[PDB]
Structure formats: structure tokens, C-alpha cells
Design an enzyme around this catalytic site. Structure first.
Site, PDB file in Angstrom:
ATOM      1  N   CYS A  88     -71.403  13.191 -31.029  1.00  0.00           N
ATOM      2  CA  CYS A  88     -70.549  12.987 -29.866  1.00  0.00           C
ATOM      3  C   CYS A  88     -69.998  11.582 -29.735  1.00  0.00           C
ATOM      4  CB  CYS A  88     -71.313  13.350 -28.590  1.00  0.00           C
ATOM      5  SG  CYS A  88     -70.445  12.841 -27.064  1.00  0.00           S
ATOM      6  N   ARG A  99     -70.249   9.209 -25.982  1.00  0.00           N
ATOM      7  CA  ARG A  99     -71.532   8.823 -25.376  1.00  0.00           C
ATOM      8  C   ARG A  99     -71.568   7.591 -24.482  1.00  0.00           C
ATOM      9  NH1 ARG A  99     -75.494   8.839 -30.237  1.00  0.00           N
ATOM     10  NH2 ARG A  99     -73.581   9.044 -31.498  1.00  0.00           N
ATOM     11  N   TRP A 158     -64.472  15.538 -21.125  1.00  0.00           N
ATOM     12  CA  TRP A 158     -63.024  15.709 -21.142  1.00  0.00           C
ATOM     13  C   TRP A 158     -62.594  15.595 -22.599  1.00  0.00           C
ATOM     14  CZ3 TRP A 158     -64.959  11.669 -17.889  1.00  0.00           C
ATOM     15  CH2 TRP A 158     -64.977  10.393 -18.470  1.00  0.00           C
ATOM     16  N   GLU A 189     -58.473  16.722 -30.795  1.00  0.00           N
ATOM     17  CA  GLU A 189     -59.117  18.022 -30.842  1.00  0.00           C
ATOM     18  C   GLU A 189     -58.052  19.111 -30.719  1.00  0.00           C
ATOM     19  OE1 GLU A 189     -63.040  18.692 -29.000  1.00  0.00           O
ATOM     20  OE2 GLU A 189     -62.572  16.973 -27.704  1.00  0.00           O
TER      21      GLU A 189
HETATM   22  C1  HEM Z   1     -67.281  12.327 -21.151  1.00  0.00           C
HETATM   23  C2  HEM Z   1     -66.442  12.889 -22.094  1.00  0.00           C
HETATM   24  C3  HEM Z   1     -66.813  13.277 -23.389  1.00  0.00           C
HETATM   25  C4  HEM Z   1     -66.060  13.080 -24.510  1.00  0.00           C
HETATM   26  C5  HEM Z   1     -64.744  12.357 -24.579  1.00  0.00           C
HETATM   27  C6  HEM Z   1     -66.747  13.695 -25.625  1.00  0.00           C
HETATM   28  C7  HEM Z   1     -66.171  13.929 -26.861  1.00  0.00           C
HETATM   29  C8  HEM Z   1     -66.716  14.739 -27.879  1.00  0.00           C
HETATM   30  C9  HEM Z   1     -66.003  15.115 -29.110  1.00  0.00           C
HETATM   31  C10 HEM Z   1     -64.594  14.730 -29.516  1.00  0.00           C
HETATM   32  C11 HEM Z   1     -66.853  15.946 -29.817  1.00  0.00           C
HETATM   33  C12 HEM Z   1     -66.526  16.611 -31.156  1.00  0.00           C
HETATM   34  C13 HEM Z   1     -66.309  18.114 -30.899  1.00  0.00           C
HETATM   35  C14 HEM Z   1     -65.959  18.888 -32.157  1.00  0.00           C
HETATM   36  O1  HEM Z   1     -65.439  18.276 -33.103  1.00  0.00           O
HETATM   37  O2  HEM Z   1     -66.201  20.115 -32.195  1.00  0.00           O
HETATM   38  C15 HEM Z   1     -68.085  16.088 -29.014  1.00  0.00           C
HETATM   39  C16 HEM Z   1     -69.249  16.776 -29.414  1.00  0.00           C
HETATM   40  C17 HEM Z   1     -70.458  16.878 -28.683  1.00  0.00           C
HETATM   41  N1  HEM Z   1     -70.675  16.335 -27.432  1.00  0.00           N
HETATM   42 FE1  HEM Z   1     -69.430  15.057 -26.418  1.00  0.00          FE
HETATM   43  N2  HEM Z   1     -67.931  14.231 -25.214  1.00  0.00           N
HETATM   44  C18 HEM Z   1     -68.000  14.016 -23.841  1.00  0.00           C
HETATM   45  C19 HEM Z   1     -69.027  14.500 -23.033  1.00  0.00           C
HETATM   46  C20 HEM Z   1     -70.176  15.196 -23.409  1.00  0.00           C
HETATM   47  C21 HEM Z   1     -71.229  15.607 -22.513  1.00  0.00           C
HETATM   48  C22 HEM Z   1     -71.149  15.568 -20.986  1.00  0.00           C
HETATM   49  C23 HEM Z   1     -72.255  16.092 -23.312  1.00  0.00           C
HETATM   50  C24 HEM Z   1     -73.529  16.557 -22.928  1.00  0.00           C
HETATM   51  C25 HEM Z   1     -74.222  16.296 -21.767  1.00  0.00           C
HETATM   52  C26 HEM Z   1     -71.805  16.030 -24.680  1.00  0.00           C
HETATM   53  C27 HEM Z   1     -72.488  16.541 -25.802  1.00  0.00           C
HETATM   54  C28 HEM Z   1     -71.957  16.673 -27.076  1.00  0.00           C
HETATM   55  C29 HEM Z   1     -72.607  17.428 -28.148  1.00  0.00           C
HETATM   56  C30 HEM Z   1     -74.062  17.882 -28.181  1.00  0.00           C
HETATM   57  C31 HEM Z   1     -71.646  17.574 -29.121  1.00  0.00           C
HETATM   58  C32 HEM Z   1     -71.775  18.345 -30.403  1.00  0.00           C
HETATM   59  C33 HEM Z   1     -71.112  19.707 -30.309  1.00  0.00           C
HETATM   60  C34 HEM Z   1     -71.218  20.455 -31.617  1.00  0.00           C
HETATM   61  O3  HEM Z   1     -71.898  19.941 -32.519  1.00  0.00           O
HETATM   62  O4  HEM Z   1     -70.632  21.543 -31.757  1.00  0.00           O
HETATM   63  N3  HEM Z   1     -70.530  15.496 -24.731  1.00  0.00           N
HETATM   64  N4  HEM Z   1     -67.975  15.368 -27.833  1.00  0.00           N
HETATM   65  C1  LIG Z   2     -61.799  25.839 -31.119  1.00  0.00           C
HETATM   66  C2  LIG Z   2     -62.045  25.842 -29.609  1.00  0.00           C
HETATM   67  O1  LIG Z   2     -62.516  24.547 -29.313  1.00  0.00           O
HETATM   68  C3  LIG Z   2     -62.869  24.258 -28.051  1.00  0.00           C
HETATM   69  O2  LIG Z   2     -62.818  25.058 -27.071  1.00  0.00           O
HETATM   70  N1  LIG Z   2     -63.325  23.010 -27.877  1.00  0.00           N
HETATM   71  C4  LIG Z   2     -63.413  22.011 -28.980  1.00  0.00           C
HETATM   72  C5  LIG Z   2     -64.880  21.640 -29.219  1.00  0.00           C
HETATM   73  C6  LIG Z   2     -65.571  21.072 -27.962  1.00  0.00           C
HETATM   74  N2  LIG Z   2     -64.958  19.788 -27.618  1.00  0.00           N
HETATM   75  C7  LIG Z   2     -65.436  18.913 -26.673  1.00  0.00           C
HETATM   76  C8  LIG Z   2     -66.634  19.159 -25.931  1.00  0.00           C
HETATM   77  C9  LIG Z   2     -67.065  18.252 -24.963  1.00  0.00           C
HETATM   78  C10 LIG Z   2     -68.339  18.524 -24.187  1.00  0.00           C
HETATM   79  C11 LIG Z   2     -66.331  17.094 -24.703  1.00  0.00           C
HETATM   80  C12 LIG Z   2     -65.138  16.842 -25.441  1.00  0.00           C
HETATM   81  N3  LIG Z   2     -64.704  17.748 -26.418  1.00  0.00           N
HETATM   82  C13 LIG Z   2     -65.328  22.092 -26.766  1.00  0.00           C
HETATM   83  C14 LIG Z   2     -63.818  22.479 -26.591  1.00  0.00           C
END
Ligand code: HEM
Ligand SMILES: CCOC(=O)N1CCC(Nc2cc(C)ccn2)CC1
Ligand code: HEM
Ligand SMILES: CCOC(=O)N1CCC(Nc2cc(C)ccn2)CC1
Ligand SMILES: C[C@H](O)[C@H](O)[C@@H]1CNc2nc(N)[nH]c(=O)c2N1
Ligand SMILES: C[C@H](O)[C@H](O)[C@H]1CNc2nc(N)[nH]c(=O)c2N1
Ligand SMILES: [Zn+2]
Lengths: 421, 421
Positions: A118, A121, A290, A295
């Protein structure tokens, strides 16, 4: 005693000691590196048909309690010691334990802080936690989820939040949401052999149909929530339209862009992961943050296995789409991405560009090394999908490792569900 | 018995068994993955002060011989038998062995085929091998290098080649090229502290100066070759200017681009790596291919620690360089890269764009799996530094592992050399 980490863009180094607390679950060996596997089993936490032996649970629980009390700016031996006592007796007299509200808040934030994949963070301390541990029905789950969606959408001024459903007991009464995300468009295989909508969602959309949902055969149809309560068969619920905020895509120059009739939802929410804390497992804990522009602009719109609109935007810009070396593809992806950021901003919906995200992550990373001698990070997921080396993270060496609390993957519910009816 | 590898873009799968033959030397554990470390000790073959003991040499030597003869379309058991004997007795009566001409050719191509971080591997069987093992002086080294450079440049129609110098003996008679590359521009630190030229080459340029080279304080001055023969102190040799082909940079649409007065050399040649084969070590083996455009456009020109011209190009284009979110950086890197490809093409110098490179690599990887059920690949180095997910390699899961023959990194010669004079 540590691993030295360097940033080739600034020359800065970090010493990583925090990795020693990591769990030994990665499948990497001296013989080969598996770092690039998308969904490694080492990051997955499958189902169970029996409770966690009090035997194995007690240590983790104590370990967690220690982590929780240690975080306090000022020791509280009494409370700490008393809590260590309470948890022990509870595990013995009941077979498991319950976290306090405050411990749950701490745990959800720490698990976020420990998410290697993520990039957002730096916001880890600003998280709204909805305690839905007393939930008991699918319809009740739907209501908590609608509340979550409304709170986080917040008229475009997106807020991060997580809803926590009941912890896993014997593994037969799991509370979870089958959808990978809370908001997602359908994908349909048309009679003529073409695919309409999100091609990567055809399988799940078909599952919804088989469960009774009426396909609307549109290009951006929001699929219903498939909710599983107390281990029972899943029930479908459609999110009210008024709660799904969408952004219509326009380009600040190319007026023909709106003619593509593209749009996307504003709320990115992961709904199918599992929260692990002190040995406890929470299979239902949807959370959201957000969006980062790329993405949508790069993956959703330009992946060949997704909306795959790159060639059409190319023609409309008048590029030589027959010659790869003209870099028409790269020119088109930038414009598509400019349109995404522009459209979100124009409608006042929070979004973040990849440069700003990369920069804030470097600040976050530096604070994590000075605060706890480590920052688990997965380079492969942190470097943006476009203009990689133009961002500071590209030049940063990183260590990837699993701590606890942690957000794990799970096996899709429909692969392992034993239908009751 | 095998690891399943998947391409999420095409859904295609691969079964990897080749990793079983890999040498257990990666620093990756179950507790932490170190896949993103730039120059790991695990991929570095340091110096020696004593010959290699036959207990290690003999087994490795038989392995190589076995590998070499196995590679035959029509087995030749008798010769295979003879060779095993010859090599065994030789290692016995001398302490080491000599590869035959064809074993050397085979070895260099297999080592390239085994290079995890090389995206141009589809050309692996097409390699000119200059056998310079009977070389004895630094001057002869210089002449072998000029021949290599002339042959490879071939007036713009670049050809791949490698020059192999004498194998290591007691580690005190190493034949090597101290330069990281055969052709590289100087970097000068000025009296006021500012830097002129390639700032990443400041240390090596200073070494050249301390050894007698007269600095020219230019922006693109080609540094001399620092050559070490038979473990002796290094000698300096300047490459004849006529052997260095350079491409002046222009943009097809922006006439002002030429005012930046930029250029780059046409021949990318790695000169400081060590070739390992059958336990034998060749610390001097410069090789070249042809450029992939992003190497110059993105890395050399846009890295902040390198020529760093991004902001200037953005201004000339009239972009809002005060807002990261306008994505001016992304628009500018694309234009700079279009200029690189156009300039090389206009001067008829072989160059390869990153899309074509990515596509050819996918073909090669497919053949490798059909041929030997494996293909060591380092995802982090194979995905281009711009437009990452727009190329097929981004979506390909890969296994990184070390085979033999292999090209290892070395410790910079100036850090370990013990000066005689
Ligand atoms: C505040 C805004 C946030 C931004 C801008 C952000 C952004 C991102 C991005 C760009 C990814 C990559 C997603 C992908 O490529 O599929 C991601 C993955 C992830 N985020 Fe964040 N995030 C945010 C908030 C959060 C929150 C609130 C949590 C949890 C409390 C979180 C937990 C994670 C986890 C566990 C992943 C991995 C998802 C996966 O492996 O499929 N994120 N996030
Ligand atoms: C292919 C469909 O993908 C999705 O719906 N998403 C793309 C993967 C995942 N991205 C996220 C998730 C979070 C929590 C914050 C920022 N970005 C959730 C939204
Ligand atoms: C014919 C065209 C070739 C192309 C287009 C090609 C392309 C590349 C590229 C783009 C890199 C990454 C360099 C970097 O990021 O610093 C690379 C690395 C490498 N190439 Fe190839 N290459 C070619 C030929 C060769 C040949 C002939 C050999 C060996 C005999 C070879 C061996 C390697 C090795 C060992 C590396 C890793 C270098 C390092 O880690 O510093 N390449 N190549
Ligand atoms: C920073 C200076 O970089 C370089 O001189 N180079 C960049 C790194 C390396 N690239 C290469 C090497 C080969 C053999 C083929 C294609 N590309 C050698 C050239
Ligand atoms: C830290 C990271 O290893 C480093 O910045 C990168 C990543 N990808 C790379 N890949 C290539 N082709 N060349 C490189 O030098 C690097 N270096
Ligand atoms: C095959 C490859 O590992 C895979 O496609 C990756 C790479 N990097 C990624 N990084 C992010 N942020 N999200 C992803 O889904 C992926 N997918
Ligand atoms: Zn690893």
C-alpha cells in the site's frame, strides 16, 4: 544485526532491524526468488473447520497485548499486567478472546501500517473504525455497509474507513462479503461472442446472475453485494444508486473525449481480505481509502484484459497506431491519465496523482525507519504502473516481510463454500 | 517438483522445473524477501588470493562438460567420455583446465541466456565471440578492445559481441577493464562544488585524472580505458575518437530540442562483469548489444542523479511545471524518448523501443519454457522504466534464480587493487 537499504536517487541509507520480528511464511529460498508472484499462498489465509487451539492462540494473544501496551507513550504495568491476565483466563475458560474497542482501533491501524503493498500508508493514523462485531444477519451486514459507503463517500471529500464484522469462531460461521470490492462494474459475455463491461468480472457477474440478479447488460452496471452471514448461504443486496458516486470522464482539451462516454466510481474499497490480530482472524473487514489516478487511467482503462480503450484514444488523437516505435501508446496513456485527474478535480472528488503519492510515501518511509527501524515494502506494487523511474520510489531499495496484525488474502468464498440449500 | 507461473494478461501458464538446477545463493529467506536489492552480494563474485581447490573445481568442471555435451542435437558419447577424462587428468596435472574454442562460445551464449536482468535475450544465439585468452599485456588488451568496438559498431548496424580475456589463476594476475562500460562520459566536480557532465561518473573520472588523464571539463567527454593485465597496475588508453559513434539529439516536431545540444554514444557495452563457467572465472569479458531507448531517454537524461534535463524540457514545452498533478513530467519524458528513437533512426543506428523489446521477450520466454522448462527472470529489471503496465512483461509472473554459466558483478577494481608502484 540488520540489512542496509539504499536510495540510489539521494544516496540515503536505512538500517532495517524490524524484519527480525517478521513471520517465516515467505516462499523465497536461496535457490529462487518468488517475489513477483501476484497472490502467493504465503500471503493467503484459507478457511478452517475447527477453532484455533488455545495452545497456539495464547502466545499470539500475549504478543499482541504486549505490542498494544508498548505503543503507549507511558507504560501502564498495572493495566498491561491485568490485561495479560484477563486474556489468559478468557482463552482458557472460553477457548478464545475478545478485543476491546480501543485494541481493535489500534489493530486496524497497525495492520494498515504493516501493508507492504500500500502506497498510501502515510495516512495510517486517520482511519474511521466501525465496530460491527455484534452483527448477526445478512441484512444487518448490508446496513452497516451502506453506512460505511455513505460515511466514506462524504459528497466527494473521501474519508478512509473499515467495518469489522465478527471474528472467526470454528470457521463454519464466517461473516464475509464475497465481492472483491464494494463497488465494481459487471462484465457480460454477449450472445454474439463479444464481452460487454469489465471483462475481468465476467466470472463473478455470472455468479450473481446464477443467484438471481437480473443482468442489465450495460457497460457500467454496479454488481450487487453477495453477503454471507454466520456461515449461511450468501444473499444478494443492491447498493442504492444514490450512494454510488461516479465521475464522468472528460479531457481538458480533447472535447471528443466525453464522446467515449466513460465514467468510474469514486470509492476504492477492498472487501475480501482478512484481518489477523493476536491470533484472531476477521474474515469480514471491508475498508476503503481514495484513488490514485493510475489505478483507473492505466489499469482499468488500458489493461488489455480490462476496458482496453488505448487504441481508440490513439486513433482519435491522430497518432500512428501502426508503429510501436512512434510511442503512440505512451502518448495516449498520459492523456487518458490527465483526463482522469482532471475529471475528479472538476467534480471535487478526492484523488491523488502518482507523483504526489510517491513523494508522500518517501516521507512516510523515512518516519517508519526512525520510529521503529523498519518499513515492510513491496517494490513491485509500490512503483506506479507508468513513469516508474521518474518517481522517487523506483530508486529505493526495500525489504518485504509479514508482521502482525496484517491484512491477508483469502480464497474466493465460492470455491470453498458448502451450500446449505 | 515445479512452480506454476502465470501471465495475468493472457491467462497463459508456465511450469518451472529448471529452478531445481539453480545454485542456492540468494539472500532471500522465509522471513524477508530481498528481491529489490540493486547489487546483492549473492550476485557478486569477489577477488581471490589463492587458486581454486580441485575438490570444488572437478565436480563443477564435470557438470559443465556434461551440460555442454547434453546440448547436442545428436549425442556424441565417446567424445563426451574423452573430454571428461582429459579435464580430470588436466585438473590433476595442472590444477585447472582450459576450455576449448567451442566450449567457450557455448559458455558465453548460455551465460547470456541465463542473465535474469537482460531483456534482449531473444538474440542469445547470435553473438560474436573474440577469443583473447592468449593475451599478455595491457596494450594487447587495448588492441583487442578497439577491434571489438569497430566490429560491433559496424557503421550503425550494431552487432553483439564479447571479448574474453585470460581466466583467473591465483587471483593476483587478473586481466580486467576497470571501467564499468567501454564508452562512458566524464563527470567533473568544479571548484565551486557544481558538477559538469555525468554526475554518476565523478569518482571514476577523478581516478582517471589521478592516473594522468587531462580533463577537458566538457559535458560529453569520453573517458579513457583503464586496463589491468596480469594483475599489474592499470594503464590508460584513450579510445580513438573515430571509433566512437555518437548520435546528436533532435525532436521531430520541436525545433528547439537541438538547442539543448544533447548527444549520446551508440554502443552500450558492459565491461566490468565476471564470467563463471565450470568453476572457472573470467574477470575480463566486455560484451555489447544495442540500446533500448528508455535507457537513454528515461534513465540517462531524466534521472535526478544523472543529466536531469526533465524540468528544462518541461519549460520549453510550456507545461505547468509547478503542478505535479498536471502530469507535465510524464508528458515531457515521452517527448524526450520520442526524440531518442527519432534521432537514432534518422542516423541509421540500431536502437530498440521498449514495446518491441517487451514483445520479443515474451516470445523468448515462451520458447525457453518449451525448451528447458525454465527462464530465470528478474521482474524488477525487465519491466521498462516508463509505461510499465502497457507492456506485456508487467503482467508476467517470473522466477529469479542463478544458474551456470553466469555473469556476476565484481567489486570495483580500484577498491581492492594493491598498487605495486
Ligand atoms: C488513504 C488512501 C489510500 C490510498 C491512496 C491507498 C492506495 C493504495 C494503492 C494504489 C494500492 C494498490 C492497489 C492495487 O494495485 O490493486 C493499495 C493497496 C492496499 N491498501 Fe492502500 N491506500 C489507501 C488506504 C488504505 C486503507 C484505509 C487501508 C486499510 C486500512 C489500506 C490497505 C491496503 C492493502 C492491504 C492493500 C493491498 C491490496 C491487495 O493486495 O490487493 N489502504 N492502496
Ligand atoms: C479492477 C477493479 O479494481 C478496483 O475496484 N479497485 C482497484 C484496487 C483497489 N484500489 C485501492 C484500494 C484502496 C483501499 C485504496 C486505494 N486504491 C480497490 C479499487
Ligand atoms: C542484443 C541486444 C541486447 C539488448 C537490447 C539488451 C538489453 C539489456 C538491457 C535493457 C539491460 C538493462 C541494463 C541496465 O538496466 O543497466 C541489459 C542488461 C544485461 N545484459 Fe543485455 N542486452 C543485449 C545484449 C546482451 C549481450 C550480448 C549480453 C551478454 C553476452 C548481455 C548481458 C546482459 C547482462 C548480464 C545484463 C545485466 C547487467 C547488470 O546487471 O548491470 N546483454 N541488457
Ligand atoms: C550510465 C551509463 O550507462 C551505460 O553506459 N549503459 C547502460 C547500462 C548497460 N546497457 C546495456 C548493455 C547491453 C549489453 C545491451 C543493452 N544495454 C550498458 C550501457
Ligand atoms: C532500487 C532498484 O533496484 C533500482 O533502482 C532499479 C530497478 N530496476 C532496474 N532495472 C534496470 N533495467 N536497470 C536498473 O538499474 C534498475 N535499477
Ligand atoms: C505479474 C505482476 O506481478 C502483477 O501483474 C503485478 C505487478 N504490480 C502490481 N502492483 C500493483 N499496485 N497492483 C497490481 O495488481 C500489480 N500487479
Ligand atoms: Zn525474494
Amino acid at each position: 544485526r540488520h540489512v542496509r537499504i539504499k536510495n540510489w536517487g539521494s544516496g540515503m541509507t536505512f538500517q532495517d532491524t524490524l524484519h527480525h520480528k517478521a513471520k517465516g511464511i515467505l516462499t523465497c529460498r536461496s535457490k529462487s526468488c518468488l517475489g513477483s508472484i501476484m497472490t502467493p499462498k504465503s500471503l493467503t489465509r484459507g478457511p478452517r473447520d475447527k477453532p484455533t487451539p488455545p495452545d497456539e492462540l495464547l502466545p499470539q494473544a500475549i504478543e499482541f497485548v504486549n505490542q498494544y501496551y508498548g505503543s503507549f507513550k507511558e507504560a501502564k504495568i498495572e493495566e498491561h499486567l491485568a490485561r495479560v491476565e484477563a486474556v489468559t483466563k478468557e482463552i482458557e475458560t472460553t477457548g478464545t478472546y475478545q478485543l476491546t474497542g480501543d485494541e481493535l482501533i489500534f489493530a486496524t491501524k497497525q495492520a494498515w501500517r504493516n501493508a507492504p503493498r500500500c502506497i498510501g500508508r502515510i495516512q495510517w493514523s486517520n482511519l474511521q473504525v466501525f465496530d460491527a462485531r455484534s452483527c448477526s444477519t445478512a441484512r444487518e451486514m448490508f446496513e452497516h455497509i451502506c453506512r460505511h459507503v455513505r460515511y466514506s463517500t462524504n459528497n466527494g471529500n473521501i474519508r478512509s474507513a473499515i467495518t469489522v464484522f465478527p471474528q472467526r469462531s470454528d470457521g463454519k460461521h464466517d461473516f464475509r462479503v464475497w465481492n472483491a470490492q464494494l463497488i465494481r462494474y459487471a462484465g457480460y459475455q454477449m450472445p454474439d461472442g463479444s464481452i460487454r463491461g469489465d471483462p475481468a468480472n465476467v466470472e463473478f457477474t455470472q455468479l450473481c446472475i446464477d443467484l438471481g440478479w437480473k443482468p442489465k447488460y450495460g457497460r457500467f452496471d454496479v454488481v450487487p453485494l453477495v453477503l454471507q452471514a454466520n456461515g449461511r448461504d450468501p444473499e444478494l443486496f443492491e447498493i442504492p444508486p444514490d450512494l454510488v458516486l461516479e465521475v464522468a470522464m472528460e479531457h481538458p482539451k480533447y472535447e471528443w473525449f466525453r464522446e467515449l462516454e466513460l465514467k468510474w466510481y469514486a470509492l476504492p474499497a477492498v472487501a475480501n481480505m482478512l484481518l489477523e490480530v493476536g491470533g484472531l482472524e476477521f474474515p469480514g473487514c471491508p475498508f476503503n481509502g481514495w484513488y490514485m489516478g493510475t489505478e483507473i487511467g492505466v489499469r482499468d482503462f488500458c489493461d488489455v484484459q480490462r476496458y482496453n480503450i488505448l487504441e481508440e484514444v490513439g486513433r482519435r488523437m491522430g497518432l500512428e497506431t501502426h508503429k510501436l516505435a512512434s510511442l503512440w501508446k505512451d502518448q495516449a496513456v498520459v492523456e487518458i491519465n490527465i483526463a482522469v485527474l482532471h475529471s475528479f478535480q472538476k467534480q471535487n472528488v478526492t484523488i491523488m496523482d502518482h507523483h504526489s503519492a510517491a513523494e508522500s510515501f518517501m516521507k512516510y518511509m523515512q518516519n517508519e525507519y526512525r520510529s521503529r527501524g523498519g518499513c515492510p515494502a513491496d517494490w513491485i506494487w509500490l512503483v506506479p504502473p507508468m513513469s516508474g523511474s521518474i518517481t522517487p520510489v523506483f530508486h529505493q531499495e526495500m525489504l518485504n516481510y509479514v508482521l502482525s496484525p496484517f491484512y491477508y488474502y483469502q480464497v474466493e468464498a465460492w470455491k470453498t463454500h458448502v451450500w446449505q440449500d
